[PDB]
Amino acid sequence: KTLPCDVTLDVSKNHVIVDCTDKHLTEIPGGIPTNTTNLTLTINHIPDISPASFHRLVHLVEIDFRCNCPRRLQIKPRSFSGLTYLKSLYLDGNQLLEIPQGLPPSLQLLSLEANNIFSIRKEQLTELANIEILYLGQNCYYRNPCYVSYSIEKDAFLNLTKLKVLSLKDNNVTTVPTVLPSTLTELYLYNNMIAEIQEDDFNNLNQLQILDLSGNCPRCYNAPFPCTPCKNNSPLQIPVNAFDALTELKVLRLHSNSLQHVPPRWFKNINNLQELDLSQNFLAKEIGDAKFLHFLPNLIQLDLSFNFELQVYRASMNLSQAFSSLKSLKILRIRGYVFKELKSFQLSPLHNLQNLEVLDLGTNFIKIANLSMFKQFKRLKVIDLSVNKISPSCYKYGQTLDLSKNSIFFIKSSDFQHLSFLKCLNLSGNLISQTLNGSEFQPLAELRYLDFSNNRLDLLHSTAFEELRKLEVLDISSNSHYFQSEGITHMLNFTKNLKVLQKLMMNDNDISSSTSRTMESESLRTLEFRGNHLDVLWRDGDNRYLQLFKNLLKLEELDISKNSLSFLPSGVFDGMPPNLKNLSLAKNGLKSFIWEKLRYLKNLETLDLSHNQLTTVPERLSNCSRSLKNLILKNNQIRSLTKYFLQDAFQLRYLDLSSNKIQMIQKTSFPENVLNNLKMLLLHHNRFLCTCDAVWFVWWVQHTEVTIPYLATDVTCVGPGAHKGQSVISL
Amino acid sequence: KTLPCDVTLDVSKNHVIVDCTDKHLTEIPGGIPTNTTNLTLTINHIPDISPASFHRLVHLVEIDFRCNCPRRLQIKPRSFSGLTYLKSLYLDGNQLLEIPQGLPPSLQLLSLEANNIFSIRKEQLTELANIEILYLGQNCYYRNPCYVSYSIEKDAFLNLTKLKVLSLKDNNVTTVPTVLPSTLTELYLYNNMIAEIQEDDFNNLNQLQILDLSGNCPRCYNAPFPCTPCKNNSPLQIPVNAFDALTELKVLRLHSNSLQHVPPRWFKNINNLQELDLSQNFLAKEIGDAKFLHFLPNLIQLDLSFNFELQVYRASMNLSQAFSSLKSLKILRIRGYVFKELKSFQLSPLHNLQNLEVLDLGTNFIKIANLSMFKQFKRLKVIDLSVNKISPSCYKYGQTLDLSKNSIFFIKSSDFQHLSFLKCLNLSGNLISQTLNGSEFQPLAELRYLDFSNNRLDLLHSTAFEELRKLEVLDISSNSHYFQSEGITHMLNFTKNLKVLQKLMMNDNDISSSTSRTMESESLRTLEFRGNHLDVLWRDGDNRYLQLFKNLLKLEELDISKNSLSFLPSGVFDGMPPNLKNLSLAKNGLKSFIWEKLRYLKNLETLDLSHNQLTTVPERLSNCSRSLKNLILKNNQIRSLTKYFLQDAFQLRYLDLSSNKIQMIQKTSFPENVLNNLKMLLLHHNRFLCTCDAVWFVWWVQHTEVTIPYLATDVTCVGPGAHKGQSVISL
Numbered sequence A, B: 001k002t003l004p005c006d007v008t009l010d011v012s013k014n015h016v017i018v019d020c021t022d023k024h025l026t027e028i029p030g031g032i033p034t035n036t037t038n039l040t041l042t043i044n045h046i047p048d049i050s051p052a053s054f055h056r057l058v059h060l061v062e063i064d065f066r067c068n069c070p071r072r073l074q075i076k077p078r079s080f081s082g083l084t085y086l087k088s089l090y091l092d093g094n095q096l097l098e099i100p101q102g103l104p105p106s107l108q109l110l111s112l113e114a115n116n117i118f119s120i121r122k123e124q125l126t127e128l129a130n131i132e133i134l135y136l137g138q139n140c141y142y143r144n145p146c147y148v149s150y151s152i153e154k155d156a157f158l159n160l161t162k163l164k165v166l167s168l169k170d171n172n173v174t175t176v177p178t179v180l181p182s183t184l185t186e187l188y189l190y191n192n193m194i195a196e197i198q199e200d201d202f203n204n205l206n207q208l209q210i211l212d213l214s215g216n217c218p219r220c221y222n223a224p225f226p227c228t229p230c231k232n233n234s235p236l237q238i239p240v241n242a243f244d245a246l247t248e249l250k251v252l253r254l255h256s257n258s259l260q261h262v263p264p265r266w267f268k269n270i271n272n273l274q275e276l277d278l279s280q281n282f283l284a285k286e287i288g289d290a291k292f293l294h295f296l297p298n299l300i301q302l303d304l305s306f307n308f309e310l311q312v313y314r315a316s317m318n319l320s321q322a323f324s325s326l327k328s329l330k331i332l333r334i335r336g337y338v339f340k341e342l343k344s345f346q347l348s349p350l351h352n353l354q355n356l357e358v359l360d361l362g363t364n365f366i367k368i369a370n371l372s373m374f375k376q377f378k379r380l381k382v383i384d385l386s387v388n389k390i391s392p393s394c395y396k397y398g399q400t401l402d403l404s405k406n407s408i409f410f411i412k413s414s415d416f417q418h419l420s421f422l423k424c425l426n427l428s429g430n431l432i433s434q435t436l437n438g439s440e441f442q443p444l445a446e447l448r449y450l451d452f453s454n455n456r457l458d459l460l461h462s463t464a465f466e467e468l469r470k471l472e473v474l475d476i477s478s479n480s481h482y483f484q485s486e487g488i489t490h491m492l493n494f495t496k497n498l499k500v501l502q503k504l505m506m507n508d509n510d511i512s513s514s515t516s517r518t519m520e521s522e523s524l525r526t527l528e529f530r531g532n533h534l535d536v537l538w539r540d541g542d543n544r545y546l547q548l549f550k551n552l553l554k555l556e557e558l559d560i561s562k563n564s565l566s567f568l569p570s571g572v573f574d575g576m577p578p579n580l581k582n583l584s585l586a587k588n589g590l591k592s593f594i595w596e597k598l599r600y601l602k603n604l605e606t607l608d609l610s611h612n613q614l615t616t617v618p619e620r621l622s623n624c625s626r627s628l629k630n631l632i633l634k635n636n637q638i639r640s641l642t643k644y645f646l647q648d649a650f651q652l653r654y655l656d657l658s659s660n661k662i663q664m665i666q667k668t669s670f671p672e673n674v675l676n677n678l679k680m681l682l683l684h685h686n687r688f689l690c691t692c693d694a695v696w697f698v699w700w701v702q703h704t705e706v707t708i709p710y711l712a713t714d715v716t717c718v719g720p721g722a723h724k725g726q727s728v729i730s731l
Ligand SMILES: *[C@@H]1O[C@H](CO)[C@@H](O[C@@H]2O[C@H](CO)[C@@H](O)[C@H](O)[C@H]2NC(C)=O)[C@H](O)[C@H]1NC(C)=O
Pocket: A015, A017, A037, A038, A061, A062, A087, A088
């Protein structure tokens, strides 16, 4: 089948999926199966649509036709009336001026985003009486302007009795389109120019659950996007008796509305509100009072970020006592509340929130913060202490103290006292210049993850991190400052004292010398050593560091890549861990990789040599390794394989030679006896010349079921002559 | 003259200087003038020396032979005895094991640095009875080891009655070389392994002026170099009665000696001490006491940097009251004294030093610092407030407040109050995100320079920097954050209100759009606009921003380079300042730079088109411009000049076509009537093919006096065949 689009079959789901994503077709291809259900026609060069485009396809329930656009796109009349079983259609980014007509009554979803439709009338919506979801957003804003306000005729959406989802974002709307259908459940009116809300705007939405009114009359100070604030810097005028009929409301986003007060009368009728967004407002004084929090006992999320007032640097964080009424609160982000010093009793209202897990306090420029005050927030899961200026992922491991990008330049044992419950500690970006001695992280008895990346660490002692008995993952990446120095001791055998260490990231360290001859660990299984200098360590005639990873008995993941290795000295594979399982040598510069030495690795399965400068493939992979399964030779320089490349290599299950200079592949090197089990195989972006010398290649590539991606677009033919750019399956 | 080395003549001085710096010679060339005075033989591949090397050269006064080394250098006996008028000699970095013998008595200077001389005896210094300066440093240290202690026989240097300067730095010295000659004036004994000083070491040095004992018993914590601290972390043991005979001592450097106390008895006899270095020590407690400062009334410089105690973060700087006894103090470095808060009265001892000019307080991690306290240090010249974490060149303009790389994230008018005397304000690296309004820098009435580079500026108002009435130079470079945003207003006409602005740096801003059509200034003379995007501003069919620089009437130097300009639209030269004098378009990417429009610039003199992708030179430079004199077409892609390039063009004074693909140059395009006035001309690293078609080129290049640098090494010949790599003067 010469279809250039992927096909997926789910007989239980009776769905046949044909997707042509980013394939640059100029017309709908012929031969599309009649039993397809999901059709994708995203970014492409399709000129227009016609009734013959979907002539014989009656079992279609989905058409994805997003962002296809010399001029705009035109749709013929009765272009979709023959799609009786149609249920969803995307027409986003097509520069359509008006809603297409003739759509089947069975249509359930319709997306018209990023178009030029700025006028909505009842007559054009008469055919959408059974629609469920309508996406009419992004029709008039700074990225795609229309220079006029959105026009809604009276009761345009009223007769859409089945409508539940309606998004009118980024549409230059001035007033709420009354009257909306009573069956609405999600209303997205955010990022518009609606300046006032009427009391008769939401009388009939009794089933509404999500209401987004974000960006109307926005806070435009230092805004990286074109936004027009309201007149006289007024907030979005919402009456007190506006959210009356909203009884099933669960999400209410009021982000960036320049709000100064939040009346408690707004939350009088919405009993089951779960998420409330109030970011980018002027509620810094309201946070001190926060009377409206007493009407939200079921609130789950509360975003109050970036509510600071300009030219004011507060001495303290003024949280109200009404924050204790948030019984069900879990996530509380109060970023952008810039203030000087964080004290112990400023978080007193949150001391009894049993369901509180995340406490975000980043981007506040906090200077003084006693970390011992967090011994009361042990039940929490994330304690965010981000880019603020405090001076002396991990979420799966337990309690997390994210101290990244602070002003900590040295570590004291007393600073981390009363923090034994910590399971992770993120110290990334602090630029700590310290020679570790094994006593800094003493109170961190239960620490399991320690992030020390983007710092200045000095491995002068092998007793570094010795007191982290329960540490499992250690990240000391991007500490290249002291490792770049030559002649000072670099004790790389500091991992011997770590009894339960499992993973070690120490990459991008520019390590070129080591006093310690070997690295020792009886529990390490993953070690990333990329972006370093093993060429000097494995220099010609230098056998000192050949067995650098031999003593890592349990090591199963070695990531020595980007290490400027022009060649591997003969003998390094003898000094490799016995239990090495997956290996990576990507982006190294490897000129010649010897293959018969791979027999010493009797457990390797995923040798990775992507983005290398190799030239020759092994003579016989079976004689090389008896367990290698997942070869990755992407972006290599290979011109032709061996006559018996995959002979007797039954254990292979993955192969990758994409982006090479290969010319021809014959049968005797690729027997089907092996190819029947290959789960994956890549041979695209290479230099196949499609002459008559590859009759078997032509026959096999278009008649086997071996998975080869991009078999009709990216894997082309270089010759001869008129056969330039030919598809390997079109031969 | 085919000498590949430059020649300089000073008849009044009677020096003829020949220099072969970095010219890779294998042997001293023949034909060297007999009347030469200075000979330079720096880094090269010279195998050895012979008496015939300087056979007939009797008027030689200077020979330079630094860092020329299959094996080391070999010097034959009597290799310098024939140099009667020899006066100075350099043999640095030649791997010599012993001092060469046979040197003339008339030698005044002898440098033997970076060699392998680790043993000094009286017999080999017997010939140096008239030496004045001796540089025996860098003989045994971590970059060039010798694995043994530096050994000197007793009274080896004693009989050198004329010795004045002796540098034994980085030589693995253990004990001072008693007894030194009594006429010593400069002793550089720093960076050694001397742990003890005896009271009988400096008895005869009563004309000594500089004593360097830095790096002995060093402080090796966070040391980026291999340094060995002494036993028990002891300081350099100096007796109290050690600096007794030293009476004319002017400079005493004790940097990195791990000193804990500085007894006042040391400074009892040195009355005229001017510079005192005490950096990288443990004198944090001594600074609080500092009793020794009462014995230095003539001290000019006092370096007390990096005296912090480990794991100690002080709350304040404890400066002693004895700092007021430094009557003549001008220079003061107190960096590395890391502490929390800088208060007003902490600098009270410095309030009465009339000669104090600079006060450096960086690398201290100061958090709270009221900038209004510096209204007392008006007589100062530089107030360094660098990488410290304070939160809310210049030296030729007057008072400087260097607030670079601080923790200031917004600017208040009250913060800079009482700082009207400021002539500079360096706010670079603070990453201030602010929309300037014209009231932030209000108290800065007399500000003449403002560095605001590496920040986040938002040109939303044209009134930015309006209150800086006396501002002359403005630096807003590397503010690409908000300028990268598309659609927001960028008022580039903010310079109209600056009446006396003279220079403007606004580079690396990635500016792609501008609401303002033109830039206005009646006094701007220099404008640097590199690292921006003028290709989109001058996009095809976009005539909005063609006259962006017309209204800069007084502009005389424009720096629109690295701006991704593939081509200049026809008409931009019609939109240029009338008084434009210097112009730069380097590293842009000009595919075709027209020259006939250059007539519109009747004042241009330094059209700079280096590192571009031009192809064709103008037909006639005389018809192009009548005042151009400084072409720079370096690193261009030019293959041949036209037939009448410099025809009738007399006003040019500089020409640069280095690193091109030019092949042949004829006479009619380069008439000597023009070349007699060219001060400079570069034609190296090009692709001349030296066939028989260039007879005039061959004759002229080796018989004219037009200045052409690297005429024998870099400007080579591509052909034909055996003439590959031939020198243009060797033809
Ligand atoms: C193929 O089209 C069908 C019909 O539009 C898609 O089925 C919908 O999937 C979403 C996501 O789970 C559900 O919310 C809808 O209720 C489904 N509708 C129906 C009628 O089943 C299906 O997801 C599409 N397949 C692909 C790969 O896009």
